[PDB]
Structures are given as C-alpha cells and as structure tokens.
C-alpha cells in the first residue's frame, strides 16, 4: 500500500479504501501508512479525518456549513456560515487555497454520488466507502 | 514564456484543464491563438460553443496553452465561474455569490446585495479597484435575460450552446467554428492511452470500428471504457449502437448527461409551438443532404420568406 501510495508522485489521484463500520476499514489504513516520509512531501499541511456518512441534499448543505467552520478554528473570519452550496464551494476553496494549502481532507463513509459531485475536481483525495469501485465515478 | 506563477497555478486550475487522454487539436490551437490576439487590448466578445460532455472545455485547454498571448490582456487572472440555466431569482442569487467571490478574505461587510442594481454597483467597484484587468468567464450561458446585465462592450469570454450568442451583445465578436476533427491515428493514440496497448497491438476490430466511426474522440472514449470490462468484441457494441446507439439509451457515463435532449431541450422548449414542431419535422429528410430552402415550404405550409427566417 505504501509502494502504491508513492505512485501519485505529487500528481492528483483518488485513493479509496472500502468496508463497513466495525469491519476494520480504519484498522487497515492505520498499519499500512505508518511510513511518514511516504506522505511527508505530499501533505505538509496535515491530514484531517472528517466523518461524512449518508447525507441527503440538506445534509450536504449542513456539512458544508460545518466544513467552513472547521477551517477557521480560531474564529479569525466572520462567524456567519455559507447560505448555499455554490457559496460554500467558494469559501472552502479560498481557505484551502490560502490558509490550508497542501493538506488532506478525508471523507469517511461516502454513500451517495450526489455528494461526490461537489468534490470531483481531479485533486488528491482519500476517502472511505462501501466499494473501491467509487474511484470510477470521479476523474483522476 | 509561461511564467512560473502559471506553471504552478495550473495544478489547481483557474479554468478547467485538458483531459488525461487527448489529442491536441493542432488545426485549431494555432489559429485560435492568432484570432485571440486580434483583440489588440480592445474590448470584444469571445464565445466557445458546445454541450456538457462534448469537449467544450477540452478545446480551450489546448488552444490557449500560449501564456504570452493573454499575459498582457489579463494580468489580474482568469476565473472560470459556472453560471448554467438560471431564472431571475437564480441570477439574483448568482450575483450575491459573485459579490462574495471578489472578497475571499472578508475584508468588506459579509452582507450581500439586495437587488440586481446594487449587485451591479458592488461588482463594478470591486472589479474597478481590487480586480481590474481580469477575466470573468461565464460557463453555460442559456438565457439572454442574464446577458442583459453583462452587455457593456467589455472583454468577455463565455461558453454557450451556439457561437451566434455574440450577435446579441455589442463589441467585436470572435468565434470558433471548430473546424477540426480527429482521424484514425489520432483515435489510435486516444485508444493507446486508455488501454496502454500500442496501436500496433490493437486488434483489427479496433481499426475497423475507427473506419466506421471515422475516429471521433467522444465515441472512442466510450467504447474503450465499455470494452475495458466487456470482452473485447467491438462487434457487440457496434452492431448494438447501429440499432439505436447509447445516445438513445442512457447508460452510465462521465458525461453530465447521456441524452442530447437534456441540454437541447433548453433551446427547443424556449421557442414557439409552430417552430418547435418544425424543428422536429426536419427528421423526415434522408441524411445527409444539404438542401436548399424551397424544399421545406410544403412541409411547414410556410411561405418562402417564412421558411427562410425560421431556418
């Protein structure tokens, strides 16, 4: 797995790990990625594991409002939240561009392609899901 | 000289980038670059046309690889913003979003414009003082109601269903006719990248189906993904599609829509009952013939001048 992760070579890609809650899906990754130098040069800005789960449209919107807050832990910007998906996309982009560039956001428990629609942008994305085949619905 | 700044920024994209599997449309890249320079620092409207999933952004990605071309035109950057089909309230919500986009660091009030007139003013001030000399690209323009708020004789690049959109707006018009297609070996290069086989390693059927489809990249991409999993029998999907291809039967696709009617219906339904029927009435003609106008008078029950205008 370590040898396959290095195949990104600093280029975009989609890494997908599959399984269900309670079947050792996170357990696999925990031992597999013990090599720091592997990803040392890939994500200097850190790795964050964020639970997503099965969400509908309004759940994706509430999750996007939560993600905006997550990027401003010290409340240095307005406490107000994005009002719609297009705005949330823009706010997250600006903060990941200027404050959190070179970092990994991990999407735990992806179930619906409606969510992935907002993330399919040919970037280095690690996510967990029911089936490794999810990588086919996205580009990279 | 592409500056190092662009060399790094392209990794994120201010605009969409070229495919993983492509063929440079050499016939268009140089001419489009030469036509873009015809602005000479003066206003104009550049329009690229096509539908979602048909390589509309793919064309621009290879055509504008020349940085120095636009280096002196938009020092403040190029931003590709999705617009899509919006009604009046959608234009208002989009204008409220555009205000936010120009203040990424929240240096001004978090409050949003309340109406279109105010939004026009706020955007103008920010583009005047903070973002002058920059390009805002409007992706997927469908309604002239939106264009009403942008027709101000400025350098505007946008994508739409038809390059003719440049006629509804004022300023020097530049369009791409897209007179280029890919041939056999170019389609074989597409295949090679998809399956990692040399074109010489590809079966006879792979060359035959190219002789049948004439090497179109939209067909080559689909068929490759289909025969990736399906045993390599070009005959299966070939004879199948001759029956009523997968443009008729929606399948799984990376394309946003697998039916033509999805995007097309926007322009067809935005018409009038008589000429909506006339559009659909054109299918009685045995392709693929270039017919003079007179021939449709009987069909439409229209007078020559009436037929000509509708056409």
């Amino acid at each position: 797995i370590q040898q396959k992760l290095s195949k990104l070579k600093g280029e975009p890609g989609w890494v997908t790990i599959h399984g269900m809650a309670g079947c050792g899906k996170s357990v696999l990754a925990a031992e597999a990625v013990r090599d720091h130098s592997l990803l040392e040069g890939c994500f200097p800005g850190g790795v964050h594991w964020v639970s997503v789960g099965k969400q509908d449209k309004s759940g994706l919107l509430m999750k996007l409002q939560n993600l905006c807050t997550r990027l401003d832990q010290d409340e240095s910007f307005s406490q107000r939240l994005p009002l719609n998906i297009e705005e949330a996309k823009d706010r997250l982009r600006i903060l990941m561009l200027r404050k959190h560039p070179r970092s990994l956001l991990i999407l735990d428990d992806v179930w619906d392609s409606w969510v992935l629609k907002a993330f399919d942008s040919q970037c280095q994305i690690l996510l967990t899901t029911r089936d490794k085949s999810v990588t086919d619905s996205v580009m990279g | 000289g592409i500056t190092s700044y662009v060399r790094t920024v392209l990794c994120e994209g201010g605009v969409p980038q070229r495919p993983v599997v492509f063929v440079t449309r050499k016939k268009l890249v140089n001419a489009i670059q030469q036509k873009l320079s015809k602005l000479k620092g003066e206003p104009g409207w550049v329009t690229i046309h096509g539908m979602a999933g048909c390589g509309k952004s793919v064309l621009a990605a290879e055509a504008v690889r020349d940085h120095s071309l636009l280096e002196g035109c938009f020092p403040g950057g190029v931003h590709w913003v999705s617009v899509g089909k919006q009604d009046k309230s959608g234009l208002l919500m989009k204008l409220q979003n555009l205000c936010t986009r120009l203040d990424q660091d929240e240096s001004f009030s978090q409050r949003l414009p309340l109406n279109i007139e105010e939004a026009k003013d706020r955007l103008r001030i920010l583009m005047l003082r903070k973002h002058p000399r920059s390009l805002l690209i409007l992706d997927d323009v469908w309604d002239s109601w939106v264009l009403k708020a942008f027709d101000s004789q400025c350098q505007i690049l946008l994508t739409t269903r038809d390059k003719s959109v440049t006629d509804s707006v004022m300023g020097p018009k530049y369009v791409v006719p897209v007179e280029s297609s890919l041939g056999k070996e170019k389609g074989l290069e597409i295949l090679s990248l998809f399956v990692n086989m040399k074109k010489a390693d590809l079966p006879e059927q792979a060359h035959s189906i190219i002789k049948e489809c004439k090497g179109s990249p939209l067909v080559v991409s689909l068929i490759g993904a289909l025969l990736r999993d399906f045993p390599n029998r070009w005959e299966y999907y070939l004879k199948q599609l001759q029956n009523k291809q997968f443009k008729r039967i929606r399948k799984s696709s990376s394309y946003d829509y697998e039916a033509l009617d999805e995007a097309m219906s926007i322009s067809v339904e935005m018409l009038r009952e008589d000429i909506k029927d006339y559009y659909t009435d054109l299918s009685i003609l045995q392709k693929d013939v270039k017919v003079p106008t007179k021939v449709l008078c009987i069909l439409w029950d229209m007078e020559t001048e009436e037929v000509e205008d509708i056409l």
Binding site: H18, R130, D131, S133 | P231
Partner: protein
Amino acid sequence: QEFVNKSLLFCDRNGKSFRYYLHDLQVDFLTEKNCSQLQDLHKKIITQFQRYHQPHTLSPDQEDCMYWYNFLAYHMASAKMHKELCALMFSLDWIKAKTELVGPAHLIHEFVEYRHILDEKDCAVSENFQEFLSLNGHLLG
C-alpha cells in the same frame, strides 16, 4: 457488473470469463433474510429451465452445462419437492449425463445425503441406486 460495482458480488475474472461468487458470510446473510421465496425460486427455475432446455439435452457445450448437474438436485431438495427430486435422480439418463459431465462421486454423495430427504419407498429405491453406482466408476473418466 453493477452488483460487483456495489460490493454485493465478487468477481473472479477467468481471463475473458467472469466467474461470480459470494463470500461465506455474504451468502449466510441472505440465507437467513430470505424465506419461502427461496422455495418458489427453486421450483420456478425448474419449470423455466424445462421451458428452454431439457436437463438431459443439456450438453457439455453450455456454460451452465455442469451448473445444473451440480445444483438442480440441490434446488429440488431445498424446495422439498421430493416428488420432483425422485423423478429427477431416479434416472439412468440423468445419471449418465451427470457422470459424463461432472463425475460420480458427488452423485453418490447425494444419494447418501438425500436418504433422509426422500420418502420411504423412495429411499428404498435410492438405496438400490447407492449399490447401482458401485458398478461404475471403473469406466467413468
């Protein structure tokens, strides 16, 4: 292919062929979830098969050629249609085909295991088949 794409089915790609399977637990789940529909499915595919190819017609040239010899008796047994199981297995044509396509050991194993499945008279007959089958296995294969 969609089932596989949804983690509902595993696929052993035998080169150009796709031999699909489930893991042990993956089977056990539906085994419990499904009820009497299963016997209806068993009975259904028996009739449906016969509507298309006869089980004796079933030549080794098919893909499912050995399938039906490995599982049809299982279907009837599961269906608890002992009258159909009797009609199927008490047949020298059925035996002939099954032993030329699959082999006699599985067959014998079934005549033994099905002794508790069949009716009294049927068991007595099947015992004749249990001894019958000892005759062959010489020329078979």
